[PDB]
Amino acid sequence: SAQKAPKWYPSEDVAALKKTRKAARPQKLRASLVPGTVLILLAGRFRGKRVVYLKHLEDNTLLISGPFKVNGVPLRRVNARYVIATSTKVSVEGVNVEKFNVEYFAKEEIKAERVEDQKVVDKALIAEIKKTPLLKQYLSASFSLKNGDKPHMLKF
Amino acid sequence: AESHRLYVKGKHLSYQRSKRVNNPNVSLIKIEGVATPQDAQFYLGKRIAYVYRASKEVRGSKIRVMWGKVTRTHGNSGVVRATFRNNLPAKTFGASVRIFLYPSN
Amino acid sequence: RYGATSTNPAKSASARGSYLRVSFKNTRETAQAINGWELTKAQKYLEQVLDHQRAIPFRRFNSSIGRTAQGKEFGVTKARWPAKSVKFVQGLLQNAAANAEAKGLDATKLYVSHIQVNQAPKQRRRTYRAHGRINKYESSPSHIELVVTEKEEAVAKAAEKKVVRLTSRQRGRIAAQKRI
Amino acid sequence: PHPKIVKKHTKKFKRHHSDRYHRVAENWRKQKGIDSVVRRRFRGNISQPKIGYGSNKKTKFLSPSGHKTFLVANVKDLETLTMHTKTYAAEIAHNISAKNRVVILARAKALGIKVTNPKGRL
Amino acid sequence: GLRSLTTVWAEHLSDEVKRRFYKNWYKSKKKAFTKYSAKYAQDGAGIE
Amino acid sequence: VEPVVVIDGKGHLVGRLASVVAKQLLNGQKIVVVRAEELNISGEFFRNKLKYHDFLRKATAFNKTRGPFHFRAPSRIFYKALRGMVSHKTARGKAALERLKVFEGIPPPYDKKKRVVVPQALRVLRLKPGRKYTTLGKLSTSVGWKYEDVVAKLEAKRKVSSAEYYAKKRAFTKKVASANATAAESDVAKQLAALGY
RNA sequence: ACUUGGCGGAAAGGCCUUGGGUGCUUGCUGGCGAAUUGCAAUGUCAUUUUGCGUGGGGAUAAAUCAUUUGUAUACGACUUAG
RNA sequence: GAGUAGGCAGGCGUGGAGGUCAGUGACGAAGCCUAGACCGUAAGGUCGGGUCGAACGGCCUCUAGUGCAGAUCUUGGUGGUA
RNA sequence: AUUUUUGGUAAGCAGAACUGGCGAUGCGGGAUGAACCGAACGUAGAGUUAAGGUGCCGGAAUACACGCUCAUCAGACACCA
């Protein structure tokens, strides 16, 4: 005997968890995020881009696409904690976003369907945009903080 | 074109200290262009990072990042308190940090 | 046996001198003046410092000893001419060089790679002090042992790779800058 | 399964003036001086062992693995942790011969008991 | 205070004042003010 | 805000400026002070002379070398008053004072750089009209500093050349303001006056 | 990147200023491209100290010791000489 | 939930002793070395690597010439001054 | 040590009364200090405060408000110099 013997060994049978009292409720998105708003992206590949808000998803992310023919941003998920909602809104009463769900962005080069349905939504968006002056050039241009610019003072 | 900025320029002033004793867990950060606690309350809960350059490529790049978040305001004159994932090293008193516009409003 | 060496025993010869009655402090300093030299420049230097042309720079055991101009060579102010030490290490340089020839090493590239002076057991005499006291009067002999190796260039060349680990974001940005 | 292990004081409790003097070992010894700054607990001196540092009773005697270490001499001693594999980690004693380590590691993997030491003694 | 803006010499410095700049003189090649003396190659352009 | 700030030390209170500059340097903002010989101290010339003579007499008795060095220049009087307000013995303090330069007058590169002031350390903004003040140009020389009128020559030269520069810049800015005024009553100018710019 | 005349000595090492050339221009209409960095991860772009091989220009020494002197010298050092 | 003097309790460590683990061990006991590891609030315990060469350990109990930094302590050795 | 109090010119002197402290006590403050102020202490996190402060050293208003003071020996926080 290098070590004598512990007489009591614990019951290595694992216990069940207590019945958790918290069910998932639908997200309270801030009033400033209305489908059709132009969002300044804050992080990722497309940080400091201008993007167009299209749909709220099941995953509490935003289905957005700054039309690929303005800023090279495809139909994408974006987190709402990484956007600054501008006070400028494009009319989105001519786009079928009902196609897109969470399994659409299952990861599992680019798929032919994904490129064509990008072009379908892009046609409707760019038709709505070209009405308002300078808004394609705005959406084309990227965002950056300059000197004298104080985020807390800057309205959007 | 020239500008690429998507953070505010913070500076590591000091730690939370007494007249003598210091608390290296809470680091005091001065944000550029903030005056009062009212102006500072925009930046409450934001993500501050300290970007610095070592000489050894660790996992792709020689640049390393020490992450934190703004906890609350400090004093009367718009200073904030920041807590970092790992505390700051103190040799960075006067070094710049980046105050990102993460969790947004 | 023979304190830590980082050289090749196939290309080395050594020489040992145990319980040699020389000032340990003087013979440590002659050894540290001669260390990392060619054996030819070393042997010549030890005959020069016997006939008072160059001096052994005393670096560690350099307490209240007279300054000298022959120190300026070594960037010191204080140097000396330990005849006894220089003669003992000369005897051990020669004996090492003989072993290095007997094994078959080119005597031209032969450079002293290791030289170490340890302390021997102290030899015991008694002096006689005022008011009828006895004191110790101790010699501090030396354990000298040196190594001479053949010089070889073309090393390091060393060592390791850039066995890199990346994230989806890193690898994606590499794939982007390539597409650009 | 276990709660995330915390240790309130990780670094060792070195005896005062163990750094200063060689006669003094760093094996913790209570400062019983009448003027000792370590005993009187002045701002800036070393910290002393206090029961309050005591590790959580659910995380106590667990390794980083999450297994209570059990010293094992021979196969007879290993064959006691058979219904206790989620609970313990066999550790061969320092004085066991290489051939006896061959037998234990064979039996350890055959029953499915985690071991911290050998290594196979190459 | 005052500071030396520049000093200009004559091309012909005697072996007297040349000896000044050496401590083992008679081993030297005595090359002091060779290039400076050769700055008088044309109508002392560097000097004027 | 700027990478390096340049402060015109003229018409400034020594200690007040020194405190402002001492905090800037610890926060890690590179600053140069110039025209350090036109600094000001509250109270008449004689009071600050006596304050200095009280400082002069303070020396190490047993070897007057290693004792407190009494630096006489107005730049070095400011440096003393600023090094007082920083923990110069610490590595942070050494690094903090490394971000500072002080000059008697406006030398090169700074001769053609923009010069700021610190309103909370201006004599004109702070001292009650009626109170008497010192000029570090007169005090510094009365206590030892030799280069009073070397700096007066070099400043008088710089101010002649910089008056010529300004007279050319202003003569030009007349043409720029006139052409910008004749750009108004344009479609673009009315759209800008609507957006506020 | 190159030329013109200049001006700057306080730390001027920088300011102007010609003609030219060669690029870009969001002053304004166009036409393609960008996805997959997958919902963020600094997501790398600045400024130094550089030896390392290339291929071009350029120049081709001194000091120390040992010897010597005595304007100097406890020893160094100093001043000499070859 | 502080604590000198002080009391009491729970343990850690050492030389031996009775019992037990049909304990470990020349395929390497004990000892020593280890900017290697793990456990313990701690006293301490355990493991890896080296050197080494003949014994030693866990546990339940018995027993004591049982734990050192101080005694201008003892013996022996070693220094700085040098 | 505040208060009452004897001797003594007096004392960081000698001797009493009640209480609170140091001794045996760390911690925040009075720059420093056995005794003063604030608070008494297992190991941590968060929040809030005490006494004390918030020009700079130094965390924190070169805060606001009404006055006074100019000193060729200014003044600046109780015990306490």
Fold and architecture overview:
The structure is cut from a larger assembly and holds chains A (156 residues), B (105 residues), C (180 residues), D (122 residues), E (48 residues) and F (197 residues). Chain B has 105 residues and is mainly beta. Chain B has one helix spanning 37-40, and strands at residues 7-17, 22-31, 47-53, 63-74, 79-84, 96-100. In chain B, strands 1-2-5-4-3-6 form a 6-stranded antiparallel beta barrel. Chain C contains 4 helices and 7 strands; from the N terminus they run βααββαββββα. In chain C, β5 and β6 form a beta hairpin. With 48 residues, chain E is low in regular secondary structure. Chain E contains 1 helix and no strands. Chain F is mainly alpha-helical and 197 residues long. In chain F, the strands form 2 sheets. A 3-stranded parallel sheet of chain F has the order 1-2-4. A two-stranded antiparallel ribbon of chain F has the order 3-5. Chain F starts with a strand and ends with a helix. Chains in contact: A-B, A-D, B-C, B-F. At the B-C interface, loops of B face loops of C. The structure holds 3 RNA strands. The PDB classes it as ribosome. The entry lists the keywords yeast, ribosome, initiation, eIF5B, GDP, Met-tRNAiMet. CryoEM structure of yeast 80S ribosome with Met-tRNAiMet, eIF5B, and GDP. Chain A: eL6.
Keywords:
part of a larger assembly, 6 chains, C: 180 residues, alpha+beta, 3-stranded antiparallel β-sheet, two-stranded antiparallel ribbon, elongated, F: 197 residues, mainly alpha, 3-stranded parallel β-sheet, 5 strands, 10% strand, RNA-binding, ribosome, initiation, eIF5B
Short structural summary:
This is part of a larger assembly, with chains A (156 residues), B (105 residues), C (180 residues), D (122 residues), E (48 residues) and F (197 residues). Chain A has 156 residues and is of the alpha+beta class.
Topology:
The structure is cut from a larger assembly and holds chains A (156 residues), B (105 residues), C (180 residues), D (122 residues), E (48 residues) and F (197 residues).
Chain A: E1 37-41, E2 50-56, E3 62-64, H1 68-71, E4 76-78, E5 83-89, H2 112-129, H3 135-140
Antiparallel strand pairs in A: 1-2, 1-5, 2-3, 3-4
Chain C: E1 12-20, H1 24-34, H2 39-48, E2 56-57, E3 79-80, H3 83-103, E4 110-119, E5 126-129, E6 133-136, E7 142-150, H4 168-179
Antiparallel strand pairs in C: 1-7, 2-3, 4-7, 5-6
Helix pairs in contact in C: 1-3, 2-3
Chain F: E1 4-8, H1 14-27, E2 30-34, E3 40-42, H2 45-56, H3 74-83, H4 91-98, E4 100-102, H5 123-126, E5 133-135, H6 136-142, H7 148-181, H8 187-195
Parallel strand pairs in F: 1-2, 2-4
Antiparallel strand pairs in F: 3-5
Helix pairs in contact in F: 1-3, 1-4
The structure holds three RNA strands.
GO biological process, one term (chain F): negative regulation of translation
GO cellular component, one term (chain F): cytosol
Organism (chain F): Saccharomyces cerevisiae (strain ATCC 204508 / S288c) (Baker's yeast)
